[PDB]
Amino acid sequence: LRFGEMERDCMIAHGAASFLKERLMEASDAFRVHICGICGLMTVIAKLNHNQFECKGCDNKIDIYQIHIPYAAKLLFQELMAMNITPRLYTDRSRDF
Amino acid sequence: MFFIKDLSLNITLHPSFFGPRMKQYLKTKLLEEVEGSCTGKFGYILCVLDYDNIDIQRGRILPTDGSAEFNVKYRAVVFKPFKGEVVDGTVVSCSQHGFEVQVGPMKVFVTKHLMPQDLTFNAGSNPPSYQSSEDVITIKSRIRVKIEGCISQVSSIHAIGSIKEDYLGAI
Amino acid sequence: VGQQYSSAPLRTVKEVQFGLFSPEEVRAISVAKIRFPETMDETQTRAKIGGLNDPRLGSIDRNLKCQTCQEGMNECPGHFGHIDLAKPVFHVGFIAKIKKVCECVCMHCGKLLLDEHNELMRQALAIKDSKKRFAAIWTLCKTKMVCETDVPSEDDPTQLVSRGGCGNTQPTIRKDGLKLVGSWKDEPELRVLSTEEILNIFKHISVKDFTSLGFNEVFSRPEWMILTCLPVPPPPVRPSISFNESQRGEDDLTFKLADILKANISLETLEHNGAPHHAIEEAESLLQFHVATYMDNDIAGQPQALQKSGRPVKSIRARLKGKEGRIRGNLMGKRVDFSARTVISGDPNLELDQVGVPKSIAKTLTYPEVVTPYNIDRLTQLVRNGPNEHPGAKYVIRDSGDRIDLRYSKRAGDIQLQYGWKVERHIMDNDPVLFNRQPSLHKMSMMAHRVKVIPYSTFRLNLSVTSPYNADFDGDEMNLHVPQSEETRAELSQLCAVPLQIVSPQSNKPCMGIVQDTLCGIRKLTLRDTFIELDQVLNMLYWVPDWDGVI
Amino acid sequence: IFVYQNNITPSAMKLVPSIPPATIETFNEAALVVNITHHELVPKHIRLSSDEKRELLKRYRLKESQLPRIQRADPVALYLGLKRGEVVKIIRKSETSGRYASYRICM
Amino acid sequence: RLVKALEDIMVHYDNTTRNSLGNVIQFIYGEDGMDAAHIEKQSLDTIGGSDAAFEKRYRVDLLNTDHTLDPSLLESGSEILGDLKLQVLLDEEYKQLVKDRKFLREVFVDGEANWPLPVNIRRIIQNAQQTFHIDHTKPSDLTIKDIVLGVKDLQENLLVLRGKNEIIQNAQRDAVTLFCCLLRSRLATRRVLQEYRLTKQAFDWVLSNIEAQFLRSVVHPGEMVGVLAAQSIGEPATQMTLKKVTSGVPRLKEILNVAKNMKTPSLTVY
Amino acid sequence: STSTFQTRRRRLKKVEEEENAATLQLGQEFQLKQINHQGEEEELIALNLSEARLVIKEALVERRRAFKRSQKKTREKELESIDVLLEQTTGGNNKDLKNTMQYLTNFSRFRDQETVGAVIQLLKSTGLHPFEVAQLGSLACDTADEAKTLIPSLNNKISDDELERILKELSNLETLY
Amino acid sequence: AGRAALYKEVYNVIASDGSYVNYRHMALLVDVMTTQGGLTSVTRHGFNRSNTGALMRCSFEETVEILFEAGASAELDDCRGVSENVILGQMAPIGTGAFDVMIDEESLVKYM
Amino acid sequence: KAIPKDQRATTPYMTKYERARILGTRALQISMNAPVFVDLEGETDPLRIAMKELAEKKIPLVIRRYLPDGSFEDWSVEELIVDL
């Protein structure tokens, strides 16, 4: 079934933020991807069997993160990439306020 | 050479552990992961000094699962090799290619072409040696190594050295 | 949630620094060389070459081979490739600022026409808004269409400043789909402002100058608005949907990549060999066409460039545009697990907070309770009932995460449960669920009820809750969502419960009323005229669930 | 403050920034006929000092941004002779409170 | 549109209305600071009547024989008469009511008292009269000192912005002005002993029950006030089945879309 | 994974690390500039063999106290007492800590925190690097010819007369193994 | 006074079907098209064109489009609004998600 | 960086949201075999036991109430009044 558009709206007015995490991810797309520290793109060659977390170009295997995003979000990111747009996902912000 | 870098660690203990003497298990988990370890960056993380005074932190619980993230700020004994500095170390392995040195928990290597010409190899010795004027490098020999090259072999940094330059060689 | 552990530290997504792909970076960030449109099979011999598919991207046919990453199909995120374009191409949408910057930057030296000598240009350079700084600079520099070799200072007019060189005129840039049109005048000569010529100028543009515009020398430079390096999307973006086994299945995106790959080696043929010049601008304009086509087909440029099927071809733009277009139907909105849609009927026996749930729906909907000594023993009875008896279990997840599908297991009766395990038990009597009647335009439209596993195939509900949901028993269809997190079912029970929203915050009045039979009966009874005799009275008094038993 | 009958020359009004720091305000007779401010619809607007403005941000933890901004051309922001940055403490009345403190930053 | 605009917007811990950045909309939510439903349409008795009806109902004058609360109303009634500081007290009482009178007559010059106000003061006393079995036969125990001041202390403990400074204390006074005018209308010395005949015990219950019922009325920081505003506008907009203007539905799309090319422009002059 | 006391803002700019050299160009953590978590601009502290040993020997003595509290309710001769504590308060799998202790209680230039003291009071005072102190105090040098060579980092850093004086003092102060 | 004419003009839309809505719901929206400095439409050229992060705006009316100027003008997402966390499948700072919960070893040790 | 426990404009009452997440995190942990700081007085439902934990106000949870400006204030479950 659909926990779609406004199906989200009403949930937000409630307060159940972690029901919205459970819904949009766990009961939907939910994915374990490997982004590089620097260019926050799904670059990382993650040899999970033998821990070689090597990244292409950014010379990494050092600072690498596991991020939890729905496959539809990782997919949409891979989609605008093939249109020269970098959705550089940083685990650590540098904005403040 | 051997220095003390104040470092951090992200231990995320599971709910079943959130009980009275948890501080003991947070510190233990740290000594598991950080103690004994070797990084590429900070070198051999040998000992997590002064067990007593360790940052605990009020760690955040996840919406997903009850687990709480804790970052432990510690003061530890570290050692990283460098290209050029000279260090003492007791020799260990030897053959035709050369001899390996034991500088702390790290292994430096001296090749036949990194040793003087007059300091030649002797396979005809038990255990294999290195003949010269007075200089005869066996296995448990004491050497001064000029760390010409540093290589980080993941869970252990190993190295290359020379005893060719003046003052260096047998101790 | 991804499947199979990784020693990688887990975290939040705290920033999303949007930018442009440096045609420098695109190359590095590539595992694949992408050179020919022979996709998969090495001449029908069921494999893949250095072509469109897995020249090192990711294999189809339930196989690893994804350049060292392998990780099957699930846990294997797509691996991007690259393709060097035979001549630079105007990136379909960034064609806007291409015309714009061109009317500001001197098409000779790479310096803004106007500068710190014009007061309103100064006023603009000061505006701290990244595109409104552009907004004024564009309006300002487009005007003076001659860069000044010399111009008078801000102090005295007989006193000039040789600031920047070149006094050469700027063109009157106007669109022509894929190539810009200039203009300088005796008699007007309009220049074919070509991709190669244009990119050049953009490289030269002073850091401070593109900085005083909406650009960045780290994430997005204007010299990357023109593509030389096209990133080849991996196959889980352009699938290989094979019919049985010996039949193709490439997505229309794989087609336009092949149709670019053709158009790349066509421009290569004319270039590397006998040059036809005003015939090279055809293979160039078709590459320029298909690179602009593969991203957007549904544009102002009359040809929607129909593939031989009459199909405009699945533009990467049309794949992300509104409702069921990723953002608004696959991201903001979704189709979820643990859901149920059923017909509705009235009820004079259920409490305001109770929901009608047929046996079959309760036996189909599972909840994972954690094997703790509190439950454990009773979960072990559920475990020896499976999905036939009302209280039973579908799957039993080990401490390790191995699904003991009760329904077909050989040890299905044995099942010696350990703690920390998860038994996937049916949703049962007085459990929490999100009952909902579409559209969900109201906070009150999506409320939480209490399961009461009834027979007969309909979702029944208390007749006073007929009003906050927008209900009428003409066979209305309602949803149901089963929480899994004991944290999530705490979220329903504490903010989403029906008894809570009795009073409407929306208008400071209660939004649940007694309706029809109860609305007419109560008035027909609360009259001076109406009375009742002992035998029928005693039945009425007993009928109050919490009556004092006092006559 | 110049009070003209019909208009001023644009040749003349370019002589307005000419004598800084002193600011030259220009109003046509037309809007002055009726007191634009003495209206039912517009509540009090108060010129808040350097310290009054700072205090607002220091206590109410705001930024030069976050504030509900005001027009410069606001018939009020010219009747008060407001300039950019100045804070306008507005005491509007409420159907459910009686009074409420709103603050605007001039543009 | 309403919900995509008012999404990010909620109630915060500064007891402010912010969002996706921190841009303030309202400095106290709802210009008052209460949880939307806790509010029942309450009546302000102070605006109403002739300035003479008000005087009979509220003015206490323990110096005049014809305006003294008779010793049938309070146990002190016969001795509380002719007292200096005791009438000086009451002056603040009636004078604060005349203060409240014109105040409410300035916010609403249409007289109407039937306004949405939190904490049903009616219901608390309703319960007090039958949960204390106050016999309006014998006089109330209370002293004029008990009543006037008992409110003067309750008036403080009714909080919105918990702040300790200038403005946070200021826009706070501003926020609970109206409720305080209603508070002063019901808990006025005469109306308390003449009309109500309630004990110190019952009076203290009336003050106690009002206090916490009010601190429950405080909006909960987090509440998606924005989404909620839209989900209370967008929802009943659907139900619209529509000396001549635009009838609700097209009228709404003119104002929401901000239209200067009005389907029905009309200037009204008084 | 164990993170550092030093952190910056190297967003997109990936091109990092300049060749490590004894020429006092070290890691981003390993500079005179780094912070002690207490918010102090602490200069990196490097220690010579023994100044070292007698710190792990120090805090491993401190650790023995804790484990037994929460349980309530001579060179060759030192080599044994060294591995004794290691089989106690040290993991036991801590191969990288064991190798170091034996080699440090073999090669150490000073057996006592009494004598180690006067050495470091004389070295970090000369006006030299915490890295040179850690190189002069463990590698028993004789001539400034020899000294300034094995540690190039000096070269012009000290008076050739002084370097000698410093080293000569350390020769009596040397443990009597 | 603008906030005013706009409000009065909306309350007389609440009475356009007689129905009630507490002052606060409209007075918020009325304040939304005012707190800018003038008057703003409830469209892609009012709220969806202002300050908010690159993803909060692309989520309505214009999408690929909005995201294209996020790319070229090297824009940034706060990850502070609803829409921001929504995409990422995260606990947004909404009601139950706003505050963060921790355990004081100290308060935890007391109980035993 | 934060703010101290004295200086709290934050309502000294627990929010209906904080109730739901404390009573939820305790529901999660208690179902996750976690230590139970209350006597299990006939109680066996994880979420329920967690409720008789906020009753005996022996929940070890502390709430980080962040101010939209940046800084924050702390409050334990014991520290919050429950007039919800």
Ligand SMILES: [Mg+2]
């Ligand atoms: Mg219908």
Ligand SMILES: [Zn+2]
């Ligand atoms: Zn990278």
Ligand SMILES: [Zn+2]
């Ligand atoms: Zn792969």
Ligand SMILES: [Zn+2]
């Ligand atoms: Zn030029």
